Write a protein that binds this ligand. Sequence first.
Ligand SMILES: Nc1ncnc2c1ncn2[C@@H]1O[C@H](COP(=O)(O)OP(=O)(O)O)[C@@H](O)[C@H]1O
Ligand SMILES: Nc1ncnc2c1ncn2[C@@H]1O[C@H](COP(=O)(O)OP(=O)(O)O)[C@@H](O)[C@H]1O
Ligand SMILES: Cc1cn([C@H]2C[C@H](N=[N+]=[N-])[C@@H](COP(=O)(O)O)O2)c(=O)[nH]c1=O
Ligand SMILES: Cc1cn([C@H]2C[C@H](N=[N+]=[N-])[C@@H](COP(=O)(O)O)O2)c(=O)[nH]c1=O
Lengths: 208, 208
Amino acid sequence: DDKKKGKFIVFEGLDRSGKSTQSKLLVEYLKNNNVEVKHLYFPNRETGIGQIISKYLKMENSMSNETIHLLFSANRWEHMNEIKSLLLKGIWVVCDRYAYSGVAYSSGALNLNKTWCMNPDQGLIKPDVVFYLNVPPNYAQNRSDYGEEIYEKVETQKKIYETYKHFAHEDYWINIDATRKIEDIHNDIVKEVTKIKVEPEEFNFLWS
Amino acid sequence: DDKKKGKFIVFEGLDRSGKSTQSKLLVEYLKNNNVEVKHLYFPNRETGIGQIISKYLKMENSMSNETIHLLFSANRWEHMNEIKSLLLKGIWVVCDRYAYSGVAYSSGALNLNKTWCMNPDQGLIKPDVVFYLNVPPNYAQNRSDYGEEIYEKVETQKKIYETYKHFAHEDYWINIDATRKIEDIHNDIVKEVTKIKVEPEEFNFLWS
Ligand SMILES: Nc1ncnc2c1ncn2[C@@H]1O[C@H](COP(=O)(O)OP(=O)(O)O)[C@@H](O)[C@H]1O
Ligand SMILES: Nc1ncnc2c1ncn2[C@@H]1O[C@H](COP(=O)(O)OP(=O)(O)O)[C@@H](O)[C@H]1O
Ligand SMILES: Cc1cn([C@H]2C[C@H](N=[N+]=[N-])[C@@H](COP(=O)(O)O)O2)c(=O)[nH]c1=O
Ligand SMILES: Cc1cn([C@H]2C[C@H](N=[N+]=[N-])[C@@H](COP(=O)(O)O)O2)c(=O)[nH]c1=O
């Protein structure tokens, strides 16, 4: 028996838009209602690949557009095992950033070619739902530690914001106004996650 | 002015089939007839990525099929700059292994999905010609240091040999019997490379 028992939820969004904050809250909420959950995020900067992705973002190095893109996708693929497993077991996975981030950022910030960009992530496990913490490009420039990494320039974030729309109208995509109080965002999130039916199912894969 | 002045030639083939030997010879031959040439090979195991690709082959680590595949492609992309440059300048590039190796090996040894496999290498510079040093899967098991790396098992090489055929009938593909004396292989190679017209041209990209 291999059906998919856990639930896989992804947060997406501009930089400094509260992805962590909201993923932590969703996690603790679920912990509270007795649902085993594992928090992951992407990129995972601890693996070999991650380490390279990391220097790239911190501008400790440079690499061509297509290399870093590929590196990002690879990084997700090295977690498909863990994820299938948790999900097989009934552990929900709350993830922050996934392939959506890949296409969005590469195609927006590095003028890559949307189909080209999706291609390598194609076949990755599809999540049950994506929460897009929607915020205006200039909004987050105020937050905590903005500007400390390669893509954290208003002009660039404006470019990215437009590419996120490439999923904006997709059934699993759930826009969320993220310019509000933390607990307002949190509650919308919960209301939507309760709508969910649990029930073992079959896995689905990007980009269906 | 950006037209492509050098010539780009790729050697392909099973393991221990004399790719190096023949690339060295072609290089020295060209050096002899006053043609600037830069020898490269793939994977390049010196870069960040390379280092990971390396442990993989030496079985010092493991990674999922799709990760290593992606890592291989990425590795080629980090050389598109160097290569375009040499070629722009009129430096010929003799390369040993390219995308053909990628599709061939991943799809054969790791049952990946041919289109999936080609997708990430799509857009890489197309070479002028591929010399496929054709040898039977059991032939090379005798050579120098066979078996010291992950794919060097007759049963696996048999699997790969069949996937190389995925280009076998392509105009740029040039089969070469490689079960012969070194200098016979060398001469066929030269005869074919002389056929070439030099003449600045436009670049072409896989997978056209
Ligand atoms: N709704 C909010 N209102 C005010 N500050 C916030 C809000 N959400 C996040 N922050 C703050 O902004 C910074 C970025 O939040 P974070 O969740 O780390 O963003 P992301 O994970 O999307 O990069 C943090 O210091 C956090 O405390
Ligand atoms: N035509 C040949 N006849 C006999 N031995 C060969 C021939 N070609 C290569 N070898 C030997 O086999 C080994 C593998 O050759 P190499 O060019 O390194 O293969 P590849 O680069 O394709 O892995 C080397 O030790 C080389 O000396
Ligand atoms: C996961 C992923 C992230 N990114 C970018 C988005 C983020 N922008 N910045 N800085 C950065 C990820 O770092 P943070 O998720 O910790 O904010 O990587 C990609 O370009 N492609 C990807 O596939
Ligand atoms: C360039 C490339 C090589 N390979 C394999 C072929 C070779 N098989 N072995 N062992 C190995 C490359 O090492 P050598 O080219 O030095 O023989 O990597 C791939 O699987 N994908 C690739 O994209």
